[PDB]
RNA sequence: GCUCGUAGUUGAGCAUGGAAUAAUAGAAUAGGACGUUCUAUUUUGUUGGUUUCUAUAGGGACGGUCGGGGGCAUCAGUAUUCAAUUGUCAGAGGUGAAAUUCUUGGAUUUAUUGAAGACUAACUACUGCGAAAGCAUUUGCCAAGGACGUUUUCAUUAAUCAAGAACGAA
C-alpha cells in the first residue's frame, strides 16, 4: 500500500452491490484505481465516474468480502495521490 | 532586572517548586530558549537571597504520591495492588531520603512517617 | 434531441426524486462511452443543455 | 471527554485573562493620558511602574479608581507645515504606543498576578505544600545577570548545588566558599 | 532487579524467541574486556547473565579473545575465562584476529546470526556494527550494573516482516507499425 | 512462587485465425559502377490515425496517547442442578459392549415459573495489561500505571542481597 493516501469520497448509498460516493476530492480519479481506508486496507476499486462538474460522484467496485450494506453514511474512502488527475484535462483546451 | 528577582522571592514564598517557577517565568516573559531560565539558576538565585528548600522536589512528589495512595487505600481496603504500589513508593522514599541525608540536603534526624 | 424511456430496477420511495435526479444530470457531465460503442472509452465531458421529464410510472417503473 | 472538558476550561481561562488584561490596559492608558494632560509633558516610566504596583496592591474597582486618581494627584505627581503637523501627530501616536507597550510590559511583570486574580474570580464564581527555609545569603561573587548569562554546565563547574546544601555544616560550607571566592579562580571562570 | 527493566528485558527476549527462535538455554559469547572488568570489579558473570536473561546460560569464548587474555598476562582473567566451556574458532594461532573481528566472524555469517548467539561485550563500535546485524542481543556491564541493550531496528523490521509472512503463509497459504501504403516515399 | 528489603560485597473500443500474393525496413551470400556504393537471390519482421481532451542504572516533572491492570457499587445475559405445573408415552443414561442407576407413583423429551452456586459463547489471543497470582456483559466512582517525546537541584542516588515484610499458593 502507498504511504500517502488522500480522502476521495464520502458514502452516499449502495446501488446494485456498488458503493456510490460523493467526491470530497477536487481531482478526478484514475479508472480502476484502488480505494482504501485510513487503515490503508483496500475495500475495492473505482468502477464508474459520473455526475456534473460541480458535484462529482463515483461508484466503487467492491472486492471479495466487502459488502456495500456494511458501510454507513459519513464513511470516508481514500485514494492514492498518484491515482488522481486534474479536471482541466477533460475540459476542452482554449 | 531586579523585578525578576522579586517575583522569584514572592513565588518561592507562596510555595512553588523551582521547576514550576521556571516554567511560569518562561511562559510569562516569552523566553526564547529554556537555557536562559532553569531550575538550577533559580536555586542559585534563591541561595543568593537566603532561601533554600526544606525537602527536595522529587522527594516531595514521592510523598505526595504516597499520601494519595494511602487516602485511596483508606477509602478502599480491598485493593492489594494499592498496597503493593504503596510499598514500592515508600521504598523509593527511603532510598532518596537516605541519599539526601548522606549528601546533607536532608537533616540527619529526618524520618519518613507512615 | 432524444426522447428516452428509463427502466428502474426497483420502485422509488419518492416519485419526485426521479425528476430531481434528472435536474442533477443537466449541464456539463462526466461520461464514459459504453462497451457497445465503437468510440474509445475514455472519460469525457458532455453538455446536456435542457431536459424535461415527460411521464413517470412508479408501478410500471 | 475529559480532554475536551480540559480544553474548554483552558480556553475559558485564557479569554478571562485576556479580558482582564485589556481592561487594565485601557484603564491605565486613560489615567495616563489624563495625567499627561494635567502635567503637560511626557511621563517617566518609573511613575507608570509605581502606579502599576499600586494598582496591583489594591483590588481594582470604582473606589480603587478614585484612589488611583488621587495617587495621580499625590505628592509623587508634584515631585515630578501641515505635513509636519501630521508627522508630529504620528510621533505623538507612536509615543502613546510606546507608553502602551510599557504598560503591557508592566502587566507582563504581573502576568502571574493577573492569573491569580483570574483564579480568585473563578473561585468566587464557583462559590502538601512545598516549603522553603531561610539560610545565610551568599551570592558567591556572582550577580543575577551573570548567573542568567552563564551556562548550566559552566555554573556547575564554578560551584555545585550540593556544595551549599541547606543542612551542610558551616565549616565545610565556609571552606568551599573560601576556595570559590578566590579572585584568580573567578577571573579564570569569567575568561572561560 | 527492578520489575520495570525486567519486564522490558522479558519483552525483548519474547521478540527474539518468536522471530529468531531463541531457545533456553541461551548461548552467550563473552569478550575479554568483560572478563577483565568482572575480574577487577569482582562481578559474578554467569550469575549476572542468568539474572539478565532470566533463564539458563551457556558461556563461550574464542581463540582470539582468550589469546589476548594471555597477552595481558592476568592469571585471574585466564582462570575466569577457562571456567567457561570452550568453543573453537577457525583462525591462525600465530596471527590471531582482533577480538571484535573474531567475534563477528563467529556471529555474523552472510549478514545473519546463524548460530543464534548472544554477544556480551564491552566494546562500543562492535556493538554498533552488531546492531546492523539483525537478531543479536547485546549485553554490557556498566558501573557494576549489567544492562541488556534495547531491540535494534533491524530486529524490529525482521519481526514485522515475519508477522506479515505469517499472515499469508503456513496454514494461511492459499496454495504496431503504419501500413506501407499509408507512409510511402516519394518517387 | 513474585516483589520490596537489612548485615556483607562491588562501583562510586471498432468482425478472429490460417494459407498465398503485394508493399515496406533490416541482416546475410554473391555480383556489377567508380575501399566507396548499388543490385540479384535467401532470411527476419510489419500491414496508418481521430470522431473533438481531437487526429549507564534508580528516581522526579511536563506534554499527547494507550491497556481483557486493580478495587467498590450497578445492569444484563448464558448454561447446569433442584423444585413445582402442562402435554405425551416405555424407555432414558452410559459404554468397546455392558453394568450401577431413574422409570405407568410417568423416567427421558417439550413448554412455563421459582430457587441455588457459579461463568461472560464466537470475536480471542504463546506477541495486549499486570511483579507474580491472574485479567473481556453494561454504566458510574476511586486511586495507580506502561510505552513515546521534551527534559531534570538529578549518583556517597546504583548493582548483588542472608534476616525480615506485602501479595499469591497452601
Ligand atoms: Zn578467532
Amino acid at each position: 500500500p502507498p504511504d500517502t493516501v488522500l480522502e476521495m469520497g464520502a458514502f452516499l448509498h449502495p446501488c446494485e452491490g456498488d458503493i456510490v460516493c460523493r467526491s470530497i476530492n477536487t481531482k478526478i480519479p484514475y479508472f480502476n484505481a484502488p480505494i482504501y481506508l485510513e487503515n490503508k486496507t483496500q475495500v475495492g476499486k473505482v468502477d464508474e465516474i459520473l455526475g456534473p462538474l460541480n458535484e462529482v460522484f463515483f461508484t466503487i467496485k467492491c472486492g471479495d468480502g466487502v459488502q456495500a450494506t456494511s458501510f454507513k453514511e459519513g464513511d470516508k474512502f481514500y485514494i492514492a495521490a498518484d491515482k488522481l488527475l486534474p479536471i482541466e484535462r477533460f475540459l476542452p483546451k482554449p | 532586572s531586579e523585578s525578576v528577582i522579586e517575583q522569584i522571592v514572592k513565588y518561592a514564598r507562596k510555595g512553588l517548586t523551582p521547576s514550576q517557577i521556571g516554567v511560569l517565568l518562561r511562559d510569562a516573559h516569552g523566553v526564547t530558549q529554556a537555557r536562559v531560565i532553569t531550575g538550577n539558576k533559580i536555586m542559585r538565585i534563591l541561595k543568593s537571597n537566603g532561601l533554600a528548600p526544606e525537602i527536595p522536589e522529587d522527594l516531595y512528589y514521592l510523598i505526595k504520591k504516597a499520601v494519595s495512595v494511602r487516602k485511596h487505600l483508606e477509602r478502599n481496603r480491598k485493593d492489594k495492588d494499592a498496597k503493593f504500589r504503596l510499598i514500592l513508593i515508600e521504598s523509593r522514599i527511603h532510598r532518596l531520603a537516605r541519599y539526601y541525608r548522606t549528601v546533607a540536603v536532608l537533616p540527619p534526624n529526618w524520618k519518613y512517617e507512615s | 434531441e432524444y426522447v428516452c424511456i428509463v427502466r428502474l430496477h426497483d420502485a422509488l420511495k419518492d416519485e419526485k426524486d426521479l425528476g430531481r435526479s434528472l435536474e442533477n444530470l443537466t449541464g456539463a457531465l462526466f461520461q464514459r462511452p459504453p462497451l457497445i460503442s465503437a468510440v474509445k472509452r475514455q472519460l469525457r465531458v458532455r453538455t446536456i443543455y435542457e431536459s424535461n421529464l415527460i411521464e413517470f410510472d412508479n408501478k410500471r417503473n | 471527554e475529559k480532554r475536551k472538558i480540559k480544553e474548554q476550561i483552558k480556553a475559558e481561562k485564557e479569554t478571562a485573562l485576556q479580558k482582564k488584561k485589556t481592561k487594565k490596559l485601557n484603564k491605565l492608558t486613560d489615567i495616563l493620558e489624563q495625567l499627561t494632560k494635567e502635567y503637560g509633558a511626557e511621563i517617566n516610566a518609573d511613575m507608570v511602574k509605581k502606579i502599576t504596583d499600586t494598582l496591583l496592591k489594591n483590588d481594582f474597582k470604582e473606589e480603587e479608581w478614585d484612589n488611583v486618581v488621587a495617587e495621580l494627584f499625590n505628592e509623587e505627581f508634584y515631585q515630578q507645515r501641515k505635513k509636519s503637523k501630521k508627522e508630529e501627530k504620528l510621533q505623538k501616536k507612536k509615543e502613546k504606543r510606546k507608553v502602551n507597550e510599557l504598560v503591557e510590559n508592566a502587566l507582563e511583570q504581573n502576568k502571574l498576578a493577573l492569573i491569580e486574580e483570574v483564579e480568585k474570580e473563578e473561585e468566587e464564581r464557583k462559590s502538601l505544600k512545598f516549603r522553603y527555609r531561610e539560610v545565610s545569603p551568599e551570592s558567591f561573587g556572582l550577580t543575577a545577570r551573570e548567573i542568567f548569562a552563564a551556562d548550566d554546565t559552566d555554573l556547575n563547574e564554578f560551584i555545585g548545588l550540593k556544595k551549599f546544601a541547606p543542612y551542610r555544616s558551616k565549616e565545610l560550607r565556609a571552606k568551599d566558599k573560601r576556595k570559590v571566592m578566590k579572585a584568580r579562580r573567578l577571573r579564570e571562570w569569567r575568561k572561560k | 532487579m527492578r520489575q520495570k527493566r525486567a519486564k522490558s528485558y522479558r519483552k525483548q527476549l519474547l521478540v527474539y524467541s518468536h522471530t529468531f527462535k531463541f531457545r533456553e538455554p541461551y548461548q552467550v559469547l563473552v569478550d575479554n574486556q568483560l572478563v577483565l572488568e568482572c575480574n577487577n570489579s569482582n562481578f559474578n558473570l554467569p550469575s549476572g547473565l542468568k539474572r539478565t536473561l532470566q533463564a539458563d546460560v551457556k558461556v563461550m569464548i574464542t581463540q582470539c579473545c582468550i589469546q589476548a587474555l594471555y597477552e595481558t598476562r592476568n592469571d585471574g582473567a585466564i582462570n575466569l575465562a577457562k571456567q567457561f566451556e570452550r568453543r573453537r574458532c577457525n583462525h591462525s594461532f600465530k596471527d590471531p584476529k582482533s577480538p571484535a573481528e573474531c567475534i563477528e566472524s563467529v556471529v555474523n555469517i552472510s549478514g545473519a546470526n546463524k548460530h543464534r548467539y548472544v554477544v556480551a561485550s564491552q566494546d562500543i563500535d562492535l556493538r554498533r556494527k552488531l546492531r546492523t546485524v539483525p537478531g543479536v542481543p547485546l549485553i554490557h556491564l556498566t558501573r557494576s550494573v549489567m544492562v541488556m541493550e534495547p531491540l535494534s531496528t533491524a530486529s524490529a523490521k525482521a519481526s514485522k516482516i515475519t508477522e506479515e509472512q505469517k499472515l499469508y503463509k503456513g496454514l494461511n497459504d492459499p496454495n504496431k507499425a503504419p501500413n506501407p501504403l499509408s507512409v510511402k516515399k516519394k518517387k
Side-chain angles (χ1 to χ4, degrees), chain A residues 1-92 94, chain B residues 1-9 11-114, chain C, chain D residues 1-19 21-22 24-26 28-32 39-41 45 60 70 77 103 106-107 113-114 128-169 172-174 176 180 182-183 185-186 189, chain E residues 1-72 74-87 89-187:
Chain A
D3 297 330
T4 62
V5 298
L6 294 174
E7 69 182 14
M8 177 64 209
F11 190 69
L12 191 47
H13 57 269
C15 181
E16 298 284 299
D18 279 7
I19 290 180
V20 191
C21 292
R22 185 179 296 113
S23 172
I24 64 178
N25 207 298
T26 61
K27 291 174 71 175
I28 312 293
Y30 276 49
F31 279 129
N32 296 318
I35 289 289
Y36 298 141
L37 299 187
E38 293 179 353
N39 302 110
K40 302 326 181 223
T41 49
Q42 184 166 353
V43 311
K45 64 182 181 293
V46 177
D47 179 298
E48 182 65 26
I49 298 151
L50 73 165
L53 302 191
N54 53 3
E55 200 178 4
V56 181
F57 313 90
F58 67 100
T59 45
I60 308 172
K61 180 67 174 66
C62 283
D64 291 331
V66 186
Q67 295 298 109
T69 61
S70 76
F71 292 95
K72 64 182 181 293
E73 187 177 1
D75 278 346
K76 292 181 181 179
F77 299 99
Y78 287 71
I79 206 181
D82 52 352
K83 288 310 226 283
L84 294 177
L85 73 165
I87 191 167
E88 286 65 71
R89 164 174 180 175
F90 309 107
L91 279 70
Chain B
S1 68
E2 183 200 0
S3 179
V4 185
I5 296 89
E6 62 86 20
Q7 292 84 19
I8 299 298
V9 176
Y11 292 161
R13 298 292 183 184
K14 67 184 289 184
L16 261 55
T17 69
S19 57
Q20 288 165 359
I21 302 179
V23 299
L24 188 153
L25 266 72
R26 270 193 316 280
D27 293 332
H29 288 86
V31 186
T32 70
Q33 202 190 6
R35 186 268 187 189
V36 193
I37 297 89
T38 48
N40 189 288
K41 293 181 181 179
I42 293 172
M43 294 299 291
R44 312 203 172 267
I45 292 194
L46 280 178
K47 183 65 176 68
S48 179
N49 294 26
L51 274 190
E54 181 183 3
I55 70 169
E57 187 197 332
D58 62 358
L59 189 82
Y60 164 75
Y61 277 111
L62 294 174
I63 292 172
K64 186 180 289 293
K65 289 190 178 191
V67 172
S68 56
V69 171
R70 291 189 296 272
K71 293 187 286 185
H72 160 74
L73 183 63
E74 275 285 332
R75 292 183 291 113
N76 296 115
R77 298 294 296 163
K78 316 294 298 283
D79 203 352
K80 308 292 180 67
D81 197 57
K83 292 177 70 68
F84 189 75
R85 312 305 155 131
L86 186 56
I87 301 299
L88 295 189
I89 286 165
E90 293 179 353
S91 68
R92 303 203 181 120
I93 290 171
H94 287 316
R95 267 142 46 198
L96 265 186
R98 184 188 312 121
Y99 170 65
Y100 281 137
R101 285 178 292 186
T102 306
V103 287
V105 168
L106 273 184
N109 48 68
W110 202 96
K111 300 289 94 175
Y112 181 63
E113 291 93 357
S114 302
Chain C
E1 274 176 4
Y2 282 103
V3 164
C4 179
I5 305 179
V6 58
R7 176 164 292 248
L8 300 189
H9 298 170
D10 198 34
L12 291 182
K13 277 74 69 177
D14 190 14
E15 202 146 5
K16 280 73 176 175
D17 276 345
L18 169 83
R20 301 170 202 174
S21 294
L22 198 72
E23 209 196 9
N24 204 0
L25 274 296
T26 306
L29 279 194
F30 279 114
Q31 273 190 353
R32 193 193 197 177
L35 277 296
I36 313 298
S37 300
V39 188
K40 47 176 58 174
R41 315 185 67 241
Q42 62 184 0
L43 186 68
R44 319 185 308 211
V45 176
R46 284 291 160 283
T47 308
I48 293 185
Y49 302 113
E50 182 65 26
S51 69
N52 169 63
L53 172 69
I54 299 177
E55 289 190 4
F56 180 45
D57 199 299
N58 203 4
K59 182 175 174 66
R60 288 262 299 285
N61 297 305
Chain D
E1 299 161 4
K2 290 180 188 294
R3 179 257 290 161
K4 292 215 305 292
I5 296 300
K6 185 182 288 186
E7 292 304 8
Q8 293 156 3
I9 292 172
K10 186 180 289 293
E12 276 151 37
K13 181 253 191 183
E14 180 68 29
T15 186
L17 188 153
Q18 183 62 255
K19 289 198 177 187
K21 182 264 289 181
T22 52
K24 294 296 184 290
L25 178 69
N26 60 59
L28 266 293
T29 188
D30 289 353
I31 62 170
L32 188 153
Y39 182 76
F60 190 76
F77 173 53
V103 176
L107 294 174
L114 275 191
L128 275 298
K129 197 72 169 175
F130 201 70
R131 185 179 296 113
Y132 296 79
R133 295 179 66 251
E134 59 273 357
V135 296
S136 302
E138 285 95 9
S139 71
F140 282 114
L142 293 196
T143 187
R145 298 294 296 163
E146 309 300 325
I147 292 177
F148 276 128
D151 189 359
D152 271 307
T153 61
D154 291 331
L155 286 168
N156 279 298
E157 154 170 17
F158 187 60
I159 190 174
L161 297 197
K162 267 146 202 176
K163 305 294 180 181
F164 43 91
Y167 298 120
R168 199 144 176 242
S169 66
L172 282 72
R173 290 185 291 114
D176 291 331
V180 165
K182 253 74 179 174
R185 186 174 182 269
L186 174 63
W189 179 78
Chain E
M1 178 159 198
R2 305 306 168 183
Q3 41 85 25
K4 196 166 72 176
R5 207 181 49 162
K7 210 171 191 180
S8 161
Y9 287 2
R10 280 190 296 241
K11 296 202 63 175
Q12 186 181 355
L13 286 166
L14 283 198
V15 175
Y16 283 126
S17 77
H18 292 127
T19 304
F20 305 101
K21 274 80 177 175
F22 272 67
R23 299 292 179 90
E24 169 185 0
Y26 298 119
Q27 276 97 18
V28 190
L29 282 161
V30 294
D31 204 4
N32 71 2
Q33 293 82 17
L34 189 49
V35 176
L36 290 171
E37 294 294 328
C38 291
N39 189 359
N40 296 115
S41 59
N42 176 5
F43 196 106
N44 189 359
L45 187 153
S47 174
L49 292 179
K50 284 157 195 172
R51 186 178 65 247
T52 309
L53 277 301
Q54 279 102 51
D56 273 318
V57 185
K58 184 176 184 292
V59 190
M60 283 74 74
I61 193 66
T62 61
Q63 293 297 110
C64 299
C65 310
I66 196 168
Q67 181 81 8
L69 283 176
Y70 313 89
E71 302 311 298
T72 59
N74 189 359
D75 303 2
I78 285 161
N79 176 19
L80 181 65
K82 67 182 290 294
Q83 283 101 25
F84 313 135
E85 190 276 331
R86 184 71 185 90
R87 186 267 182 275
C89 68
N90 303 359
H91 303 118
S92 304
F93 279 21
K94 311 177 181 180
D95 196 4
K97 290 184 168 175
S98 178
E101 297 294 328
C102 167
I103 206 72
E104 293 179 353
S105 62
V106 170
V107 168
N108 190 47
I109 295 94
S110 308
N113 194 0
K114 187 178 290 294
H115 295 285
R116 256 177 299 290
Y117 279 136
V118 180
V119 183
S121 177
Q122 295 297 109
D123 167 358
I124 176 173
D125 56 356
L126 182 63
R127 288 199 316 250
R128 298 291 183 184
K129 55 194 187 168
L130 282 193
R131 292 180 179 91
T132 74
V133 192
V136 185
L138 300 174
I139 305 175
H140 57 292
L141 184 70
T142 300
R143 304 169 74 131
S144 188
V145 192
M146 185 179 288
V147 173
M148 173 196 279
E149 281 210 351
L151 189 84
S152 65
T153 78
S155 305
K157 290 187 286 185
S159 186
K160 179 204 59 64
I161 297 169
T162 312
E163 301 299 302
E164 271 194 89
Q165 317 312 99
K166 279 194 186 179
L167 289 185
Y168 325 119
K169 303 292 186 292
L171 273 171
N172 284 355
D173 204 295
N175 189 359
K176 182 176 78 177
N179 204 75
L181 304 173
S182 173
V183 293
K184 180 146 40 183
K185 323 293 164 186
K186 313 215 65 177
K187 290 188 306 170

